[PDB]
Amino acid sequence: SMISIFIAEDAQMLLGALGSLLNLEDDMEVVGKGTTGQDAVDFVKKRQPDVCIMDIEMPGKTGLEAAEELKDTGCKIIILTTFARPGYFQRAIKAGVKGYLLKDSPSEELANAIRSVMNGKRIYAPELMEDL
């Protein structure tokens, strides 16, 4: 009924603002927060949240590396990036991420992608697909 979400973002300002923006939803709940890819692997393998919001560039293990370690878990991973750097998209689809969105997405569109991902859909930003 309530979507449990873990957020992995190394920038505390954004990690805190994302949690605040997602906790405003009636059907969502931020059950944990992390700043590294290992924090995400540790929480998802232990607590098993419905969704894991994953930044790419983080210290230790990137969100893409963390997504590869959680590929065969039942957690739906949504990647968030500011820039669409080459190979990120191909590595994201090969790791089986359910969403690949922009950090600067309006909260309305982010919550909608979380619902679509929970409905089994794959939500990828057109900007991020390395063919325009």
Added chain:
Amino acid sequence: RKERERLEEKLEDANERIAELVKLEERQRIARDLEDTLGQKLSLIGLKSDLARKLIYKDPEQAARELKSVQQTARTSLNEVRKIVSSMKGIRLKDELINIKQILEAADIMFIYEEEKWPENISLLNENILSMCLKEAVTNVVKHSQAKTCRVDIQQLWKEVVITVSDDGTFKGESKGHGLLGMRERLEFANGSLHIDTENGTKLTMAIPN
């Protein structure tokens, strides 16, 4: 005689190719830094302003706190761009050079200058005074000379920066609080000088210590 001239172009071009590579190496470095700083801060600004809107009615005190942070982040983000110049000396006069080029082109007066000659080791105060004087010398050319050409020379000669502004129009003067007295007073207060030639058009020679 002329195989030396043709050999120096190979030297100039080879140096230019290497310079283009150093330029590009720097360009890539700034591109990474922008992505990290500005990019991050703009994403945050967008998010906090979205969250702040969501709290207008629910928690107005929290919305205010978010807006204070958005304000700060935007101000510092402009300061980062202002900082990536490496707080160089020579900027104010270089910006005034751009202003006078636009003004003279808009007035259909040919502007003759050379950017390769603009002193760098000038104090910020004396640079600002020269910018004021350069602006006024060109304003006078546009307003009064009726010139078709205006020549600006900026040279570091001995322990002074000397700016000459000349035009091919006609001098119209024969005073208190106006540009010519104003420039002379400001320059002289900074231990500089202003001289004028009104025979072949009008030529101002301003000097300031450096």
Added chain:
Amino acid sequence: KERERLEEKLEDANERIAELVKLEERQRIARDLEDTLGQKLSLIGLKSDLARKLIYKDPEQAARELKSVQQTARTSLNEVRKIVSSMKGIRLKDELINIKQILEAADIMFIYEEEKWPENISLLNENILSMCLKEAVTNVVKHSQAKTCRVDIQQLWKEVVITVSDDGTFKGEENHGLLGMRERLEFANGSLHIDTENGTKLTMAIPNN
């Protein structure tokens, strides 16, 4: 050794010149960024200040201001994305596509098989190799009169090695693009070698990892 003290003076003199070219470019970019993102960021600061002032006085007006701040920040992030992409130069994978189109349009068979593709090449060295690959193929099209052109791009040891060979005939003398490529590669502590017996074969290497 004296050879060391002099090499230190040589390194420092090159560095001083480099710093001046770097600074000249830095100022140019600073002007372009201020020109574009300057007003946008200042506007964001002002509207977010005004919006804070209206939270209690006129909450509807504060909401309107925040919608504009949101929009301005999003669009500015988009200007930045545009800038960063441009500043990062040319990608080698994109240059590979350009040369395939060029050779096909010139009716020269293009032979390329992806083998040992460079994992992590610096953006600068990637841009240099793109420039050289473009020029090696431009020379094939313009001068060789080849019917086939073979390109190999491999990560071998701590270098990226690109070889461009053709089955045409070399037209130059024993001793522009060839000097240009050699100079740009050598600046990057790389190398350019050429074989002119069976057509023309360029071997360019640039350090990497």
